[PDB]
Amino acid sequence: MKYIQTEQQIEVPEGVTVSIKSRIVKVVGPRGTLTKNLKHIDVTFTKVNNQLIKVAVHNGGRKHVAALRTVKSLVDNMITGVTKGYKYKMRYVYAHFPINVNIVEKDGAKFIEVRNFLGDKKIRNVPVRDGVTIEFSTNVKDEIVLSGNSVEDVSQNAADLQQICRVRNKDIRKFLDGIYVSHKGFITED
Amino acid sequence: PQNDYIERHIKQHGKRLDHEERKRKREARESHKISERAQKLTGWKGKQFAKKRYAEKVSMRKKIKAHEQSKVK
Amino acid sequence: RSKRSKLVTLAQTDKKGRENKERIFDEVREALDTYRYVWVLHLDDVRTPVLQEIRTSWAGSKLIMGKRKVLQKALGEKREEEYKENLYQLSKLCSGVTGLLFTDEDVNTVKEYFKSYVRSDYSRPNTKAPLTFTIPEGIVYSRGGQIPAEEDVPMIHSLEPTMRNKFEIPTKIKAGKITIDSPYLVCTEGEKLDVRQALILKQFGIAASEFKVKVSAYYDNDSSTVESTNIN
Amino acid sequence: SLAAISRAKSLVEQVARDYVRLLKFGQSLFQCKQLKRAALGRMATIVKKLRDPLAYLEQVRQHIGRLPSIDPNTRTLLICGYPNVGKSSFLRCITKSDVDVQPYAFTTKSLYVGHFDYKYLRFQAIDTPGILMNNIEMQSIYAIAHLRSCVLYFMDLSEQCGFTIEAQVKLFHSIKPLF
RNA sequence: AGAACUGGCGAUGCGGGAUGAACCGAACGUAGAGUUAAGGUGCCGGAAUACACGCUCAUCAGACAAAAGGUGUUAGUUCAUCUAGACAGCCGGACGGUGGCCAUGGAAGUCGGAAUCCGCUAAGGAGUGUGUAACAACUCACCGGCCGAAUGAACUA
RNA sequence: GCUUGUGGCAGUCAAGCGAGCGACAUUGCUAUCAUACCGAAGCAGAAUUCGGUAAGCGUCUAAUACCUACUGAU
């Protein structure tokens, strides 16, 4: 009903620091730095004690107010990724054809290869987004560990990896071959 | 073709590793998909969807009333 | 609009409302003047069969339970609201589950009964494991191999997805048998139990942790005095 | 159900023919529309009257398509005995057919079939679910009798299945006459 | 459709409606000044992109198919409780005859048939669901612990 | 401000309006053909059913649902 003012509070630990200006946002921390553009969100930021950041919307409706909470959520996610980071345990399984996963740097660009899926001779590649690192899990068979700072980039890379290898024109209930996300967590063990 | 193998195959190897997550997300997206369909599907398809939704709502109301009446006794 | 509707199913039971709370409030006052002594138990969690066993073995001393605020209001949060002299003292002391146990037995009987009594229970989160439990390097079992595997039936495959997607353990299914690629040490003595670890232990039925209810405060209906003891 | 389907089809044909023969004498557009609605509604009611037989046909179709395709005329061998005395393992090792051997009585609830070649001659084997009346027992008896195949009775000298030898002997004697 | 009704048209110019006989205005000689009706005041097109209160994101909005649906949006009516802890969210309890009685190869809450009680707890359905050949195992609805104020259901605009 | 898919009605329902009516169910005899891209289905494969986008192209085979304009040339 045309709220006079609504706001949310963002908490930033001493391990990270941020600088706020026009909606281009800067974040720095032990794991590196991240940036995001929110000029289309039309929200105002306000610092109080260098550890709490206030985001407020004036005369904004429910539809507009909904972006206020999402801005705080994105800021918190970026801070957590910069501090702790996100590690995704990607697992692939098969029954007859051993799925082959390889990493290449064709034309400089890093790519993740998938081969031998259900005997398919086609070569599948997925570009590695910036900030994402790939390494084979230890003491775990047929596991790929995607690691990175940006939540969106790592999540999109994992989704592309698990979704490009679709089972096509086959019994989904029976053909279990494929790649799926097995667990979502943080790089830092804590 | 021999038997109910698919059930046996599911028991012996299970469904897709993400099958539970896929089903849960599909079920949870139906709430918004129903609204999108109500705001879409022009033509006779809209008429059919509206009639089906009205019938489902009437059946739900009848079931609720029957349960409430029998709940007391 | 846009508000999500509450999920509803036609269950066989309905809500109780504030009628039960008011009834308990009245009953607390009606029973305070009957029993000679009143106690409050800091029973964090008690299995219903265990509570029923305690009640039947202690039925002579009726037990009263309910919401903390309701019971404190019935007993009185201050002197001006106390039903009897010094009654409000135990109301402030209690912090966890009420466990308002009215009894006609003196302090000696109550403390002896609560010291001798002891029962086993699952290890809850934030506690330390009372035993060591390592799953074998192959097919898993209902009890996790803590008992001879010749009689421990393998875990039902239907529950494998829950372990795979919630407990994060490297469980896999081979010909309908749940198997892991290494002997995962879910818990060890001295290790703080996580929520997932507690759930895993409950699934395996490893109730090795001991449990015994403790009394927080004491009140006398004829001496107008209140005492607190740490005896469990 | 088949007769009901046929009768519904015949009634639909008759109604359509009659309404074609009847609609030719309409005058107004609404009269023709009402007659068309009459024919369509009669067809719809006839179809809806088959709501139960349609579901029954769907269910029976879903199951018939997965039944084993055995040939009674060709040489074949039948294995029979008390429920899961061990014949399940025998089938699991004599042919590629994968069947469990769990200790409980009715480990198999269908006539599992497997094929093998002896002296380059095609042979098929059928695993009887079990014999104690019941539908499963009747199916096993019919398979034993009608099929032009020998029957391999199974017994247990050990305590497997928790059944004594006397019970197996009694069952064999009871079913002996017809095989 | 049977008529009576009073007006427009016929014998009617003119202004507005993008151009019409069923609409609105309108007492028709030749010129000058000033004020109006309908109709308008973004340009074509003479006149404020005037003031102020709210509504709408609409893949032909806008200048009789309709009774309903939409987790579209903005306002009210009737029932709900609420600092004895509103709604939601995270944990725990979630019993005992009982594996109730029949249905039987095997089903104990969940394959079917009817009963659906007392005993007790702040709270337990002879079980609202998931699942096992059958027990098991998870879960609601019923409460308790944490958390600190408005929320839950149907209707009128 | 025409047209498109569920035969009239006796009783049972009867949400709601307000004396009397009446939705949705029910007993009574009675604008894609194929190619292209996706979702569901006892979808093992093959083959096939239903549902959506798509008018680009075809429709025994994969399938056979007297003056202005005009192309040309000064």
mmCIF file with all atom_site columns, N, CA, C and O (backbone and C1' of nucleotides) in Angstrom, chain E residues 11-22:
data_model
loop_
_atom_site.group_PDB
_atom_site.id
_atom_site.type_symbol
_atom_site.label_atom_id
_atom_site.label_alt_id
_atom_site.label_comp_id
_atom_site.label_asym_id
_atom_site.label_entity_id
_atom_site.label_seq_id
_atom_site.pdbx_PDB_ins_code
_atom_site.Cartn_x
_atom_site.Cartn_y
_atom_site.Cartn_z
_atom_site.occupancy
_atom_site.B_iso_or_equiv
_atom_site.pdbx_formal_charge
_atom_site.auth_seq_id
_atom_site.auth_comp_id
_atom_site.auth_asym_id
_atom_site.auth_atom_id
_atom_site.pdbx_PDB_model_num
ATOM 1  P P     . A E 1 11 ? -39.275 15.863 -50.580 1.00 0.00 ? 11 A E P     1
ATOM 2  O "O5'" . A E 1 11 ? -38.783 17.271 -50.022 1.00 0.00 ? 11 A E "O5'" 1
ATOM 3  C "C5'" . A E 1 11 ? -38.643 18.391 -50.891 1.00 0.00 ? 11 A E "C5'" 1
ATOM 4  C "C4'" . A E 1 11 ? -38.570 19.690 -50.126 1.00 0.00 ? 11 A E "C4'" 1
ATOM 5  C "C3'" . A E 1 11 ? -37.745 19.643 -48.841 1.00 0.00 ? 11 A E "C3'" 1
ATOM 6  O "O3'" . A E 1 11 ? -37.108 20.902 -48.633 1.00 0.00 ? 11 A E "O3'" 1
ATOM 7  C "C1'" . A E 1 11 ? -39.963 20.247 -48.323 1.00 0.00 ? 11 A E "C1'" 1
ATOM 8  P P     . U E 1 12 ? -35.784 21.289 -49.458 1.00 0.00 ? 12 U E P     1
ATOM 9  O "O5'" . U E 1 12 ? -34.669 21.463 -48.335 1.00 0.00 ? 12 U E "O5'" 1
ATOM 10 C "C5'" . U E 1 12 ? -34.384 20.412 -47.419 1.00 0.00 ? 12 U E "C5'" 1
ATOM 11 C "C4'" . U E 1 12 ? -33.241 20.770 -46.502 1.00 0.00 ? 12 U E "C4'" 1
ATOM 12 C "C3'" . U E 1 12 ? -32.728 19.627 -45.627 1.00 0.00 ? 12 U E "C3'" 1
ATOM 13 O "O3'" . U E 1 12 ? -31.319 19.757 -45.440 1.00 0.00 ? 12 U E "O3'" 1
ATOM 14 C "C1'" . U E 1 12 ? -33.503 21.384 -44.251 1.00 0.00 ? 12 U E "C1'" 1
ATOM 15 P P     . G E 1 13 ? -30.314 19.459 -46.659 1.00 0.00 ? 13 G E P     1
ATOM 16 O "O5'" . G E 1 13 ? -29.616 20.866 -46.930 1.00 0.00 ? 13 G E "O5'" 1
ATOM 17 C "C5'" . G E 1 13 ? -28.634 21.374 -46.040 1.00 0.00 ? 13 G E "C5'" 1
ATOM 18 C "C4'" . G E 1 13 ? -28.634 22.881 -46.012 1.00 0.00 ? 13 G E "C4'" 1
ATOM 19 C "C3'" . G E 1 13 ? -27.456 23.524 -45.294 1.00 0.00 ? 13 G E "C3'" 1
ATOM 20 O "O3'" . G E 1 13 ? -26.288 23.606 -46.093 1.00 0.00 ? 13 G E "O3'" 1
ATOM 21 C "C1'" . G E 1 13 ? -29.448 24.493 -44.509 1.00 0.00 ? 13 G E "C1'" 1
ATOM 22 P P     . C E 1 14 ? -24.936 22.877 -45.617 1.00 0.00 ? 14 C E P     1
ATOM 23 O "O5'" . C E 1 14 ? -24.588 23.574 -44.226 1.00 0.00 ? 14 C E "O5'" 1
ATOM 24 C "C5'" . C E 1 14 ? -24.200 24.939 -44.174 1.00 0.00 ? 14 C E "C5'" 1
ATOM 25 C "C4'" . C E 1 14 ? -24.022 25.417 -42.754 1.00 0.00 ? 14 C E "C4'" 1
ATOM 26 C "C3'" . C E 1 14 ? -23.081 24.603 -41.881 1.00 0.00 ? 14 C E "C3'" 1
ATOM 27 O "O3'" . C E 1 14 ? -21.712 24.895 -42.105 1.00 0.00 ? 14 C E "O3'" 1
ATOM 28 C "C1'" . C E 1 14 ? -25.068 25.049 -40.687 1.00 0.00 ? 14 C E "C1'" 1
ATOM 29 P P     . G E 1 15 ? -20.593 23.775 -41.822 1.00 0.00 ? 15 G E P     1
ATOM 30 O "O5'" . G E 1 15 ? -20.520 23.688 -40.232 1.00 0.00 ? 15 G E "O5'" 1
ATOM 31 C "C5'" . G E 1 15 ? -19.815 24.669 -39.485 1.00 0.00 ? 15 G E "C5'" 1
ATOM 32 C "C4'" . G E 1 15 ? -19.797 24.345 -38.011 1.00 0.00 ? 15 G E "C4'" 1
ATOM 33 C "C3'" . G E 1 15 ? -19.277 22.968 -37.630 1.00 0.00 ? 15 G E "C3'" 1
ATOM 34 O "O3'" . G E 1 15 ? -17.863 22.884 -37.622 1.00 0.00 ? 15 G E "O3'" 1
ATOM 35 C "C1'" . G E 1 15 ? -21.276 23.402 -36.455 1.00 0.00 ? 15 G E "C1'" 1
ATOM 36 P P     . G E 1 16 ? -17.140 21.486 -37.950 1.00 0.00 ? 16 G E P     1
ATOM 37 O "O5'" . G E 1 16 ? -17.514 20.556 -36.710 1.00 0.00 ? 16 G E "O5'" 1
ATOM 38 C "C5'" . G E 1 16 ? -16.958 20.798 -35.426 1.00 0.00 ? 16 G E "C5'" 1
ATOM 39 C "C4'" . G E 1 16 ? -17.370 19.746 -34.427 1.00 0.00 ? 16 G E "C4'" 1
ATOM 40 C "C3'" . G E 1 16 ? -17.208 18.299 -34.867 1.00 0.00 ? 16 G E "C3'" 1
ATOM 41 O "O3'" . G E 1 16 ? -15.875 17.833 -34.749 1.00 0.00 ? 16 G E "O3'" 1
ATOM 42 C "C1'" . G E 1 16 ? -19.324 18.589 -33.844 1.00 0.00 ? 16 G E "C1'" 1
ATOM 43 P P     . G E 1 17 ? -15.331 16.683 -35.732 1.00 0.00 ? 17 G E P     1
ATOM 44 O "O5'" . G E 1 17 ? -16.109 15.375 -35.266 1.00 0.00 ? 17 G E "O5'" 1
ATOM 45 C "C5'" . G E 1 17 ? -15.931 14.846 -33.959 1.00 0.00 ? 17 G E "C5'" 1
ATOM 46 C "C4'" . G E 1 17 ? -16.944 13.772 -33.653 1.00 0.00 ? 17 G E "C4'" 1
ATOM 47 C "C3'" . G E 1 17 ? -16.968 12.590 -34.609 1.00 0.00 ? 17 G E "C3'" 1
ATOM 48 O "O3'" . G E 1 17 ? -15.965 11.631 -34.323 1.00 0.00 ? 17 G E "O3'" 1
ATOM 49 C "C1'" . G E 1 17 ? -19.176 13.350 -34.241 1.00 0.00 ? 17 G E "C1'" 1
ATOM 50 P P     . A E 1 18 ? -15.450 10.628 -35.468 1.00 0.00 ? 18 A E P     1
ATOM 51 O "O5'" . A E 1 18 ? -15.221 11.570 -36.732 1.00 0.00 ? 18 A E "O5'" 1
ATOM 52 C "C5'" . A E 1 18 ? -14.295 12.646 -36.686 1.00 0.00 ? 18 A E "C5'" 1
ATOM 53 C "C4'" . A E 1 18 ? -13.371 12.623 -37.877 1.00 0.00 ? 18 A E "C4'" 1
ATOM 54 C "C3'" . A E 1 18 ? -14.044 12.476 -39.234 1.00 0.00 ? 18 A E "C3'" 1
ATOM 55 O "O3'" . A E 1 18 ? -14.539 13.704 -39.741 1.00 0.00 ? 18 A E "O3'" 1
ATOM 56 C "C1'" . A E 1 18 ? -12.255 10.943 -39.076 1.00 0.00 ? 18 A E "C1'" 1
ATOM 57 P P     . U E 1 19 ? -16.107 14.045 -39.643 1.00 0.00 ? 19 U E P     1
ATOM 58 O "O5'" . U E 1 19 ? -16.722 13.437 -40.981 1.00 0.00 ? 19 U E "O5'" 1
ATOM 59 C "C5'" . U E 1 19 ? -16.866 14.238 -42.145 1.00 0.00 ? 19 U E "C5'" 1
ATOM 60 C "C4'" . U E 1 19 ? -17.583 13.495 -43.244 1.00 0.00 ? 19 U E "C4'" 1
ATOM 61 C "C3'" . U E 1 19 ? -18.830 12.727 -42.829 1.00 0.00 ? 19 U E "C3'" 1
ATOM 62 O "O3'" . U E 1 19 ? -19.974 13.561 -42.758 1.00 0.00 ? 19 U E "O3'" 1
ATOM 63 C "C1'" . U E 1 19 ? -17.470 11.381 -44.245 1.00 0.00 ? 19 U E "C1'" 1
ATOM 64 P P     . G E 1 20 ? -21.175 13.228 -41.746 1.00 0.00 ? 20 G E P     1
ATOM 65 O "O5'" . G E 1 20 ? -21.997 12.078 -42.480 1.00 0.00 ? 20 G E "O5'" 1
ATOM 66 C "C5'" . G E 1 20 ? -22.588 12.305 -43.756 1.00 0.00 ? 20 G E "C5'" 1
ATOM 67 C "C4'" . G E 1 20 ? -23.690 11.318 -44.053 1.00 0.00 ? 20 G E "C4'" 1
ATOM 68 C "C3'" . G E 1 20 ? -24.913 11.403 -43.140 1.00 0.00 ? 20 G E "C3'" 1
ATOM 69 O "O3'" . G E 1 20 ? -26.092 11.103 -43.886 1.00 0.00 ? 20 G E "O3'" 1
ATOM 70 C "C1'" . G E 1 20 ? -23.965 9.246  -42.985 1.00 0.00 ? 20 G E "C1'" 1
ATOM 71 P P     . A E 1 21 ? -26.904 12.276 -44.626 1.00 0.00 ? 21 A E P     1
ATOM 72 O "O5'" . A E 1 21 ? -28.245 12.410 -43.777 1.00 0.00 ? 21 A E "O5'" 1
ATOM 73 C "C5'" . A E 1 21 ? -28.208 12.808 -42.414 1.00 0.00 ? 21 A E "C5'" 1
ATOM 74 C "C4'" . A E 1 21 ? -29.385 12.262 -41.645 1.00 0.00 ? 21 A E "C4'" 1
ATOM 75 C "C3'" . A E 1 21 ? -29.166 10.916 -40.971 1.00 0.00 ? 21 A E "C3'" 1
ATOM 76 O "O3'" . A E 1 21 ? -28.509 11.031 -39.721 1.00 0.00 ? 21 A E "O3'" 1
ATOM 77 C "C1'" . A E 1 21 ? -31.230 10.898 -42.144 1.00 0.00 ? 21 A E "C1'" 1
ATOM 78 P P     . A E 1 22 ? -28.138 9.717  -38.873 1.00 0.00 ? 22 A E P     1
ATOM 79 O "O5'" . A E 1 22 ? -29.434 9.460  -37.984 1.00 0.00 ? 22 A E "O5'" 1
ATOM 80 C "C5'" . A E 1 22 ? -30.008 10.510 -37.213 1.00 0.00 ? 22 A E "C5'" 1
ATOM 81 C "C4'" . A E 1 22 ? -31.369 10.134 -36.683 1.00 0.00 ? 22 A E "C4'" 1
ATOM 82 C "C3'" . A E 1 22 ? -31.351 9.232  -35.451 1.00 0.00 ? 22 A E "C3'" 1
ATOM 83 O "O3'" . A E 1 22 ? -32.440 9.562  -34.589 1.00 0.00 ? 22 A E "O3'" 1
ATOM 84 C "C1'" . A E 1 22 ? -32.480 8.134  -37.216 1.00 0.00 ? 22 A E "C1'" 1
#
